[PDB]
Amino acid sequence: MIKKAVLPVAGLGTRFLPASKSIPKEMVTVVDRPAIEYVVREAVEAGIEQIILVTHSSKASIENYFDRNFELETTLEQKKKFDLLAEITQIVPEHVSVISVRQPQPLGLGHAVLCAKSVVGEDDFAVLLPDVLVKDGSGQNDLSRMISRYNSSQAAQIMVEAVPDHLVDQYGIVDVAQSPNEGESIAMQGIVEKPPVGAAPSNLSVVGRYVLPAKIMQLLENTPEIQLTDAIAMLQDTDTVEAYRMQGQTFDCGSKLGYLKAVLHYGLEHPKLGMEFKQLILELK
Amino acid sequence: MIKKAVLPVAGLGTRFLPASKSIPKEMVTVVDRPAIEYVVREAVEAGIEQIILVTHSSKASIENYFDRNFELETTLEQKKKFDLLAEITQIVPEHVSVISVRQPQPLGLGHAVLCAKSVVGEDDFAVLLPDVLVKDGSGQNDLSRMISRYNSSQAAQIMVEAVPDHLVDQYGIVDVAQSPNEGESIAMQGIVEKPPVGAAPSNLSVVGRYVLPAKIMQLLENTPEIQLTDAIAMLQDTDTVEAYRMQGQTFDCGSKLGYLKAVLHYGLEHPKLGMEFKQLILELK
Amino acid sequence: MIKKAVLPVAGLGTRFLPASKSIPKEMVTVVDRPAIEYVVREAVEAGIEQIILVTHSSKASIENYFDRNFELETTLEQKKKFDLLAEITQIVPEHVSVISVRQPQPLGLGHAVLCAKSVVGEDDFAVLLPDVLVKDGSGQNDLSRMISRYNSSQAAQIMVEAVPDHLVDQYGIVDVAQSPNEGESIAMQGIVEKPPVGAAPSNLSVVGRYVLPAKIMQLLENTPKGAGNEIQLTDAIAMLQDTDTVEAYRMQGQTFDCGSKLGYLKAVLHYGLEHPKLGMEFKQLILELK
Amino acid sequence: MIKKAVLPVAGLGTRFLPASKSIPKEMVTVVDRPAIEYVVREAVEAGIEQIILVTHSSKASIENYFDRNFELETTLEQKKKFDLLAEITQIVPEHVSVISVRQPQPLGLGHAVLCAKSVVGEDDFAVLLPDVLVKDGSGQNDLSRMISRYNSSQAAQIMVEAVPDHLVDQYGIVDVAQSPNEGESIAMQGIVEKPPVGAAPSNLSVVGRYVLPAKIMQLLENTPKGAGNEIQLTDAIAMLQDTDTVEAYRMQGQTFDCGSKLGYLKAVLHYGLEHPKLGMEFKQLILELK
Ligand SMILES: O=c1ccn([C@@H]2O[C@H](COP(=O)(O)OP(=O)(O)OP(=O)(O)O)[C@@H](O)[C@H]2O)c(=O)[nH]1
Numbered sequence A, B: 001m002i003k004k005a006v007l008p009v010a011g012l013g014t015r016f017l018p019a020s021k022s023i024p025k026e027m028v029t030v031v032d033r034p035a036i037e038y039v040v041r042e043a044v045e046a047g048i049e050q051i052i053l054v055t056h057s058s059k060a061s062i063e064n065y066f067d068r069n070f071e072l073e074t075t076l077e078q079k080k081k082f083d084l085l086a087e088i089t090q091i092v093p094e095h096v097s098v099i100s101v102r103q104p105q106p107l108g109l110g111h112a113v114l115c116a117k118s119v120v121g122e123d124d125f126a127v128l129l130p131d132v133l134v135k136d137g138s139g140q141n142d143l144s145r146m147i148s149r150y151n152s153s154q155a156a157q158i159m160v161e162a163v164p165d166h167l168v169d170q171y172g173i174v175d176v177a178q179s180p181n182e183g184e185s186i187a188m189q190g191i192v193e194k195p196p197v198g199a200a201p202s203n204l205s206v207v208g209r210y211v212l213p214a215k216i217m218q219l220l221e222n223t224p225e226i227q228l229t230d231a232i233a234m235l236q237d238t239d240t241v242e243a244y245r246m247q248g249q250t251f252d253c254g255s256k257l258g259y260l261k262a263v264l265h266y267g268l269e270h271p272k273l274g275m276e277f278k279q280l281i282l283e284l285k
Numbered sequence C, D: 001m002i003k004k005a006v007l008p009v010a011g012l013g014t015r016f017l018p019a020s021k022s023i024p025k026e027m028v029t030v031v032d033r034p035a036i037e038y039v040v041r042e043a044v045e046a047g048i049e050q051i052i053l054v055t056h057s058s059k060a061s062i063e064n065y066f067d068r069n070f071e072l073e074t075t076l077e078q079k080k081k082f083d084l085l086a087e088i089t090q091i092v093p094e095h096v097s098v099i100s101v102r103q104p105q106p107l108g109l110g111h112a113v114l115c116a117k118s119v120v121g122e123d124d125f126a127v128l129l130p131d132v133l134v135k136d137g138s139g140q141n142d143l144s145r146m147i148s149r150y151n152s153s154q155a156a157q158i159m160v161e162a163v164p165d166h167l168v169d170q171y172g173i174v175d176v177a178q179s180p181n182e183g184e185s186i187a188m189q190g191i192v193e194k195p196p197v198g199a200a201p202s203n204l205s206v207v208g209r210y211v212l213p214a215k216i217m218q219l220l221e222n223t224p225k226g227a228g229n230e231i232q233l234t235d236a237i238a239m240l241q242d243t244d245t246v247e248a249y250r251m252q253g254q255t256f257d258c259g260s261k262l263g264y265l266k267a268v269l270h271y272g273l274e275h276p277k278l279g280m281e282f283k284q285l286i287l288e289l290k
């Protein structure tokens, strides 16, 4: 049922500078590969088949990464390095397609999603914010848990995670009666942006993963900058909308410390370099 | 009904070299603008709303041309040149979208179209070969004549034009009982590629404009290189397929002489420079 | 003798839109190649060895033009188009180097030439404005003549061409005593911008070809007007006047301004006709026009 | 004294895939900036003024890094992030020029340095391999020491570092008589590639930092092996031996090979810890690991 995902990648990264000065914030290297690969992986391992990049003129290198590189391939055949040729050819299955649409101007997330309207048509769809990485410890990643819940419930889904009470002021936070269990959804009434450290209706931050109906493109055409949460509220007035509580862990690769935490955590766990990396950490003091 | 058009632009141009050495053959300048603009114009003036570029890693400059250029725009505001700012902002209507999908490898036109399968879905669609320019003398361009004929007849359409008998050997040529009139279609049985100057079943060359059903994506998955005409033949075995005979004139911007003929002909007729150009020609001898 | 040339190619090409919305002005097709090829050819046929491109972050396609393209070469081999592959491989003699340096911000032509300071060092150099094409010549080209002149005289050289009396307000024209003969120089004491139709000191227009000494870099670092128009080349040449002779060289040849849309079409026509292979078939296309 | 450095940065980065599939190896994030920033910093802190990038047609992002980004600057202004805008504006001292020349085909390191011939001219120059980071130092850095050494002695200088006896087969190691002290040089008579574990002429590894005279360009034009491995730098330095002293300089500091995936992670760790702002909070992330 849910086969399309919008990845809004058009935004420059003022928060991961100068790393992203001359390359997309999404192509910054997490262990041995760009951060966007962990996000595209996440989508594909949860049944996506059309990755829709809403992109900017400065970000060919993102499209290129999921395309074939003639000169680099046919100097891994001139040399005899077919292990590597495997790492640059088979990034996503033959049946997964990567599409591009440009965001003319940076008029917000809701505007980004709306640029995708031509491509999503009547299909429901996932939204995945590339600067957030999500790490699963099971065999069903939180995007898949969330999609199967959309599929049965037919309620829009918004991935959330609890934050310390003293930082609710840094995040979108959901208006929810009771906090659901790790892995399940509750009904939600709306999102409060950056509520003061006293007056939040939960400790559950909007993490940056959504499943939404085609309907919302209409809603986005008619908001009071176009911001997503406005269209999500407008959705309240017709349908049920649930907040999904993730089982996994997040890293904001936008913040310098969230990216250094992603390198450490994803590195300890790399198939090959994990044990040799664990070693390099031990040798430090 | 017919709202999507596939523009296969992934092919390098060995025939317009060195012009296209470091820029796409499609961005070569015809009077005062890239050749791709005449083709996108053609599609939009005939009711297209999703231009689908099947593209290559070397061709960002094509996507860029239909996107906004921050630094160039906001030094036409620092300067006070709003006539020009009009020529770089309003290339295609707000409601026309430009989509990109990459052709991994150059496995032929039929492969190019098939790369578009994710985006076309069940919709019927137009195919427009960018290195051919088409010039109309009426108020209905041959792509529009051809689309309205698909719409009523439900028969796939293949734009054709008559060639001298001594050059049938340079072109795809249609197998057709009688030649239709300029502006109308006949039934056709197949295309013969480059038949010898004796044994052609008509003098009507395949010009490089099609209207096809979604069906053909299935057909293209199952051809004996994947070449379009094979899938078109396979279509014969189920549906009627008509050859449309254009009222207009062509220029192959692929050949050095067809491009010099496009500059002359399109230049004599430029809103502003037409009369000043006509002048420059007169002054020559 | 003179081995180095600065091509300032960092402009956003506002005069030639939308053609240059998304590719350099310098990569516009004149017949069958980009304009920049005709300017590099001209330099090279005058013994220039080092082409110094003062460039902008979107002008990679200029640099790619004089470099080798793997995927393009290998598709030409696979099609056994060997003469073509030989042409797109030898764009510049093998002894010719193409360098790049960035113009950080677009502060005009003197600031652009100042950006080549480190690559020019103590050498004397030509400047070629790439938006001007200069065609025609019996033997050696106008740039060669003007260089042999800089070599003998050791006077800065500024290429000028005679314009009709009623258009001298469209041009920088030079303060000279008498107009020299075609292919000769004369001392000049200033250039006036868009002089008034009545009273201009000659009919000889500044063309966009210079031979200057390294000295000029030090002068470009000490010309005012930094916030108004930023660094003006004519102001630095004015300062050179104070210690050094400066001469106006008069072309034998004929220029074409591929900055205007209408000068571009003049060039396509004139180069088209003279094209060694298409010229005759292109004349044929013209005749057939009515 | 020594004002010029060639950074050969034209490789396709096969050792560091898929990280470098679609961005230069040289633009890989080490903590919070690309690797190339650390190599340019090092050169500059040793009085290098002209950075000469020998580059490939896909390495624009390297050149864009040391240039100004209009759209990026104007979005930083609109967000009143003025300290950041000041940082991304002054990446290199204002007296430092970054030049580019293309390596037409990938024929190895001597062919790359030969591509800088026209920009080096008669000047003596450093070569810095950008895939090697060199950290640490009490006062002036290893490259400064090695340059002041090239200045006094007028002997080609090759930076070497002591490796464990059982790994000398992973390295080019130098034929020296005695190993010098850290921060000192000694005459060397050859480098042997991956010498055998038993018998190597020292434990001092070639690091990828050189000070060479212009002479070497003429030698690089006359070293054989053109079709085998193409032009080898060690072959040209061997030929320099024939007329000129050549010395091995021993680092005070410590290198990191961001060509391997595992040397990259060493660098991130060691630079992370020493990062002037994140170091302490990054140590904190390590402690919390179990
Ligand atoms: O107009 C918009 C806004 C946001 N986004 C998407 O949302 C995120 C916005 O990325 P930003 O560039 O806005 O975030 P940042 O961390 O650099 O911080 P500031 O610039 O606010 O200081 C990115 O993931 C982007 O792709 C868009 O694509 N377009």
Ligand SMILES: O=c1ccn([C@@H]2O[C@H](COP(=O)(O)OP(=O)(O)OP(=O)(O)O)[C@@H](O)[C@H]2O)c(=O)[nH]1
Binding pocket: B008, B009, B010, B011, B012, B013, B014, B015, B016, B054, B103, B105, B106, B107, B108, B109, B111, B112, B129, B130, B131, B254, C079
């Ligand atoms: O695999 C293919 C084949 C063809 N095409 C599309 O069809 C045309 C093929 O363009 P070509 O590059 O094949 O044509 P050319 O005129 O340069 O001649 P040769 O290379 O054959 O010598 C272009 O319009 C291209 O976009 C593709 O997009 N992909």
